Amino acid sequence: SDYVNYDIIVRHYNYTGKLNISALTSVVFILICCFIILENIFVLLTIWKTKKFHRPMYYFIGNLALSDLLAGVAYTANLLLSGATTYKLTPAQWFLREGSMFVALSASVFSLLAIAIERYITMLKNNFRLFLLISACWVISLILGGLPIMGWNCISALSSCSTVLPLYHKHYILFCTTVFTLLLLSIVILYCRIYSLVRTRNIFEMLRIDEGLRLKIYKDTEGYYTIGIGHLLTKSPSLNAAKSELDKAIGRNTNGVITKDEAEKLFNQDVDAAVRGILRNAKLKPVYDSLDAVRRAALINMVFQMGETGVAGFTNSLRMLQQKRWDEAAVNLAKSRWYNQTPNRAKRVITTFRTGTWDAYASRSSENVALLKTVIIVLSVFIACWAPLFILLLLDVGCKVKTCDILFRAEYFLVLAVLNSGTNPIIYTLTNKEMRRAFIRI
Ligand SMILES: CCCCCCc1cccc(NC(=O)[C@H](N)CCP(=O)(O)O)c1
Ligand SMILES: *[C@@H]1O[C@H](CO)[C@@H](O)[C@H](O)[C@H]1NC(C)=O
């Protein structure tokens, strides 16, 4: 008879040992999955109902919700076709009962990839090609999840059958575990790169306004010759004396004309010197250690104009920054000589000490900053729900039948990965209130 008969299921659930060992709890999860259906319906309903959410990143966030929406479906069917009903299924129906979970996982992982790569392009800066990436994602998912249905299983190799999945081959689970963890590794390494490089990029754009970029040697309001983002070359009133310093600070004979990178690489040096000038002063270091990344960079901007002693000459305001009473600090500095010399320059710096956000230099630099935080947490919860399963799966690959006993009760791990599908809609309305105000708007 066809190797699509009900005896193979009995035979394979016999060799593992979950045939005689069999146990109300289901109808509870069946109902919990219906909550995961709605939770992700509103995610796909609000992104379709909000004009500001018709942005490329939100389409990948929605595809992720569609993956976790079909996961909630595929698992309601799993609960209805598990336990006693497992044996009223053909091997094909079985590979279709579990294959739908792997397709829902594969799609979810590449959705996180598509969201992580749609972050790296915000700093380093296209609508049809997106519903081409989303189409590619599900085709690649069906191919990986369908491999056991297409033959890569163990229907004759009982010795090679997985304990947690009796018809799946240990080589298939070893492959999936490896591919998806390598992708999840690459995504973690990508967000850290995006987080730290934007931390530098924000400082590069802040002073690109307050000091102003230049490729040809100019003179400041005081008189002395300057280049790029406020880099003083010499106090000397000779242009060739300034060209001497520039052709030595860059190396090549620039003749006063430098490059975009040569300006940026010369800029970081004045950032390094400004940062070191804070880490060598007892009135600046505690202030810097107490400030957040936005206000840490805001202090570096004041030091990039006056200096160590120049910014130290504001102790009455620095003390207020240590006590976290930004409001009084913003007033004292507005009344001091610094807010009068360069008024619009200080105005932006003081607004950053008051707010604590870049909503003084660039419009979309708070909402994008809030998304980066939330978007990473979505991955942080994902990698925390699947890692216990992926480890047990990786144990089973190296386990012999009826040897490892933790495998015979893997359901604790399996449902953690299922409940992960309902954590993402909740994580949006809590951490990113930009999204939360659009949901409550329905
Ligand atoms: C490395 C790839 C991992 C994909 C995990 C697929 C998955 C996730 C969550 C649940 C399930 N399916 C189950 O829990 C099944 N009911 C297996 C239990 P049984 O077949 O009854 O022994 C399958
Ligand atoms: C399969 O179960 C039957 C009894 O239901 C028995 O003949 C046999 O011990 C089991 N198979 C293996 C491979 O242990």
Side-chain angles (χ1 to χ4, degrees), residues 1-23 25-38 40-48 50 53-54 56-117 119-149 151-192 194-198 200 202-213 215 217-218 220-221 223 225-234 236-244 246-282 284-318 320-321 323-334 336 338 340-353 355-362 364-368 370-371 373-400 403-435 437-440 442:
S1 298
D2 284 334
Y3 266 35
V4 182
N5 77 139
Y6 300 91
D7 188 31
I8 291 172
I9 309 300
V10 175
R11 179 189 294 173
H12 282 68
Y13 277 82
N14 183 16
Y15 185 89
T16 60
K18 203 199 74 175
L19 185 67
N20 300 339
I21 314 300
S22 299
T25 59
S26 295
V27 290
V28 179
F29 297 108
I30 299 175
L31 187 63
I32 301 172
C33 297
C34 297
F35 186 94
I36 305 175
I37 306 301
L38 292 176
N40 290 288
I41 289 177
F42 290 98
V43 175
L44 286 161
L45 199 63
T46 55
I47 291 175
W48 170 70
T50 307
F53 288 8
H54 276 258
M57 183 193 63
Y58 290 94
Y59 296 108
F60 308 116
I61 293 178
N63 186 45
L64 176 147
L66 184 63
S67 304
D68 290 347
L69 183 152
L70 298 175
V73 176
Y75 193 74
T76 296
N78 180 271
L79 293 162
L80 293 171
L81 300 167
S82 291
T85 54
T86 305
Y87 305 100
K88 73 172 188 180
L89 297 170
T90 60
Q93 287 177 325
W94 195 100
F95 293 121
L96 199 160
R97 189 193 67 174
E98 298 300 322
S100 59
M101 301 300 297
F102 284 70
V103 174
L105 170 61
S106 183
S108 296
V109 173
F110 296 114
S111 296
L112 291 161
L113 167 66
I115 301 174
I117 205 66
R119 290 289 70 182
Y120 190 88
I121 307 172
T122 64
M123 55 178 296
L124 185 63
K125 187 179 181 179
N126 56 347
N127 299 329
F128 161 82
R129 63 189 67 177
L130 301 180
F131 295 103
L132 192 73
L133 292 175
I134 297 175
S135 297
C137 174
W138 286 95
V139 171
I140 303 168
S141 299
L142 289 163
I143 293 173
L144 291 172
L147 297 172
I149 322 170
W152 184 27
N153 54 47
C154 65
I155 306 176
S156 181
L158 290 168
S159 60
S160 301
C161 291
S162 175
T163 315
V164 48
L165 291 80
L167 276 69
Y168 274 47
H169 202 105
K170 293 176 182 177
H171 291 105
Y172 174 83
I173 285 181
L174 180 59
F175 174 79
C176 297
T177 301
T178 297
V179 175
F180 299 131
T181 53
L182 291 170
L183 295 172
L184 291 180
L185 178 63
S186 305
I187 313 306
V188 168
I189 305 172
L190 186 55
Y191 286 118
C192 298
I194 300 169
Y195 178 79
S196 60
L197 298 171
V198 168
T200 306
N202 293 344
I203 300 177
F204 176 73
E205 289 295 330
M206 188 191 189
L207 284 163
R208 191 217 70 182
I209 305 170
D210 293 0
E211 292 289 347
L213 181 64
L215 297 179
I217 301 177
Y218 72 97
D220 69 332
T221 59
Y225 294 94
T226 308
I227 193 63
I229 305 180
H231 180 86
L232 190 70
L233 294 164
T234 185
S236 183
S238 176
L239 179 61
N240 296 326
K243 290 186 176 182
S244 182
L246 184 65
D247 296 356
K248 195 62 184 179
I250 306 301
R252 64 176 191 89
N253 302 10
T254 60
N255 187 20
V257 177
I258 60 176
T259 312
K260 187 285 180 180
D261 291 9
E262 294 178 357
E264 183 178 13
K265 279 62 180 180
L266 186 65
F267 163 77
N268 300 142
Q269 298 179 1
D270 297 50
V271 177
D272 178 58
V275 167
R276 290 178 183 267
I278 298 174
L279 301 171
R280 56 168 284 189
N281 190 324
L284 298 176
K285 190 198 71 176
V287 175
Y288 185 89
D289 296 5
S290 60
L291 298 167
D292 57 313
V294 184
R295 287 184 179 92
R296 285 192 176 190
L299 179 60
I300 300 169
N301 193 304
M302 293 186 63
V303 176
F304 202 91
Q305 186 180 359
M306 290 76 72
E308 305 181 29
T309 307
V311 174
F314 300 108
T315 53
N316 55 356
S317 301
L318 293 167
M320 295 173 175
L321 297 166
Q323 295 185 186
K324 306 299 173 298
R325 305 304 298 267
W326 316 113
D327 306 321
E328 296 71 6
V331 175
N332 290 227
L333 289 167
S336 62
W338 163 66
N340 299 19
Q341 182 187 15
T342 60
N344 295 356
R345 189 272 173 84
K347 190 68 179 62
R348 290 182 293 271
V349 178
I350 294 173
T351 305
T352 298
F353 281 107
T355 58
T357 188
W358 303 106
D359 292 340
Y361 296 89
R364 289 77 175 185
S365 295
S366 182
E367 59 183 59
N368 301 345
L371 293 160
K373 294 292 183 297
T374 296
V375 161
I376 299 176
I377 314 170
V378 179
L379 180 72
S380 299
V381 175
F382 180 91
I383 65 81
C385 297
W386 284 93
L389 184 65
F390 274 74
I391 291 172
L392 188 66
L393 293 167
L394 198 63
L395 288 168
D396 189 15
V397 173
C399 283
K400 193 175 182 181
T403 307
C404 304
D405 192 271
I406 304 71
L407 304 174
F408 293 93
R409 191 57 191 178
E411 296 295 347
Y412 292 101
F413 304 85
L414 290 158
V415 181
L416 183 66
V418 169
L419 296 170
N420 172 47
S421 301
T423 62
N424 300 333
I426 300 175
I427 213 171
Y428 302 135
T429 58
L430 301 181
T431 58
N432 187 272
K433 290 295 175 62
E434 181 186 14
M435 290 171 173
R437 197 171 183 178
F439 164 74
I440 200 68
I442 314 298

